[PDB]
Amino acid sequence: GYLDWITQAEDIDPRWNRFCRRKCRAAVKSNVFYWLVIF
Amino acid sequence: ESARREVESQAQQQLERAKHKPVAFAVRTNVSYCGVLDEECPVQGSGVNFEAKDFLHIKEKYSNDWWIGRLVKEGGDIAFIPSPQRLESIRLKQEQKARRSGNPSSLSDIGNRRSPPPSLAKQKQKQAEHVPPYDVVPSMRPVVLVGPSLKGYEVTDMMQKALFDFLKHRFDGRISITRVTADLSLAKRSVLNNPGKRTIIERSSARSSIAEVQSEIERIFELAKSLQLVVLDADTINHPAQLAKTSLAPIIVFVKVSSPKVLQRLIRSRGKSQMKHLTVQMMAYDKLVQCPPESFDVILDENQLEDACEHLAEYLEVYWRATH
Numbered sequence: 001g002y003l004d005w006i007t008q009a010e011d012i013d014p015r016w017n018r019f020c021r022r023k024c025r026a027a028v029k030s031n032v033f034y035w036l037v038i039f
Numbered sequence: 040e041s042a043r044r045e046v047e048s049q050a051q052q053q054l055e056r057a058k059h060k061p062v063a064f065a066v067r068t069n070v071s072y073c074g075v076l077d078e079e080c081p082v083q084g085s086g087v088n089f090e091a092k093d094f095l096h097i098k099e100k101y102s103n104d105w106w107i108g109r110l111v112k113e114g115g116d117i118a119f120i121p122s123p124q125r126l127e128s129i130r131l132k133q134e135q136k137a138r139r140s141g142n143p144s145s146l147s148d149i150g151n152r153r154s155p156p157p158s159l160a161k162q163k164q165k166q167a168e169h170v171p172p173y174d175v176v177p178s179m180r181p182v183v184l185v186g187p188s189l190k191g192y193e194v195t196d197m198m199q200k201a202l203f204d205f206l207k208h209r210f211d212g213r214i215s216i217t218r219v220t221a222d223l224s225l226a227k228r229s230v231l232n233n234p235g236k237r238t239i240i241e242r243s244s245a246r247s248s249i250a251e252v253q254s255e256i257e258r259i260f261e262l263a264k265s266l267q268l269v270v271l272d273a274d275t276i277n278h279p280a281q282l283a284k285t286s287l288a289p290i291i292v293f294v295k296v297s298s299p300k301v302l303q304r305l306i307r308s309r310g311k312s313q314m315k316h317l318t319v320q321m322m323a324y325d326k327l328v329q330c331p332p333e334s335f336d337v338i339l340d341e342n343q344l345e346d347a348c349e350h351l352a353e354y355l356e357v358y359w360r361a362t363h
């Protein structure tokens with residue numbers, strides 16, 4: 001819970017990469033991706 | 040006596056017509072004085088006994104003895120707060136209740152040495168410090184971020200980066216986050232009549248940063264005046280002790296990481312920019328964990344970003360709800 005917390009700080013603009021990472025990171029923790037991979 | 044009846048409701052009508060009166064300023068109290076024991080007040084009844092470290096928002100100017108202010112608890116109402124002088128005058132009465140208030144002991148010695156209370160037994164003396172019972176505080180308590188290590192380091196700057204980001208989105212339209220790069224350690228409520236008023240003095244303080252240290256104090260003061268949440272995240276705050284005696288008296292948020300072993304692998308994964316001062320992070324937490332728990336205003340020991348965010352957000356709205 002701490003390595004990703006500081007990683008969440010990297011996702012914030014102080015590049016398109018951080019916007020790319022931010023969208024994909026929340027995509028995994030969506031409660032729909034989990035059921036999709038289960039299916 | 041019909042004179043008291045008219046003046047009793049004179050304040051009642053004046054303070055009821057406009058229930059949207061702007062908050063002129065706020066004050067803090069730290070004296071255990073009971074406002075109900077002394078049956079003396081503009082409106083007779085049972086006055087509010089606001090205890091130590093309770094903020095009173097004085098929004099009206101009645102006279103030089105009692106002032107109208109509101110407290111910072113939920114469901115606050117319109118109350119009265121006597122002047123600090125008045126409190127100094129009435130604090131002197133507290134020692135008057137005893138048999139003697141000066142030097143002469145009453146140990147079976149009456150009628151031989153009267154010893155009336157001289158100027159040394161009054162409030163004229165004790166002027167070397169003469170700490171006032173009331174202290175100036177901003178409209179709302181500022182929030183600053185400390186821990187889990189010294190500020191300016193990789194992780195500590197990283198932990199606040201995600202935390203401050205959440206506040207502006209959740210509290211949009213009510214918050215203002217500012218960054219000040221100037222020192223704040225040397226800031227006391229009474230050090231001089233006019234610290235660094237003139238920069239052409241060419242003395243021990245003219246060339247120092249005190250010429251701009253006082254300027255930012257009003258900047259925080261004016262930020263609170265505009266009725267919005269203020270955030271202070273300077274590089275000069277690393278412990279709540281030094282800021283516990285200034286005029287600001289802010290809110291200290293704690294992000295303790297529980298065992299010191301966690302911090303280690305948190306910084307070890309960063310890169311070669313960290314082990315150049317890897318060891319001082321332990322004493323950075325060690326010199327910060329020894330502080331008594333009651334000094335901190337909130338605790339965030341949760342290991343998840345989301346849970347700690349909702350833990351802090353719930354406290355701020357209660358402060359927001361109370362002061363409205």
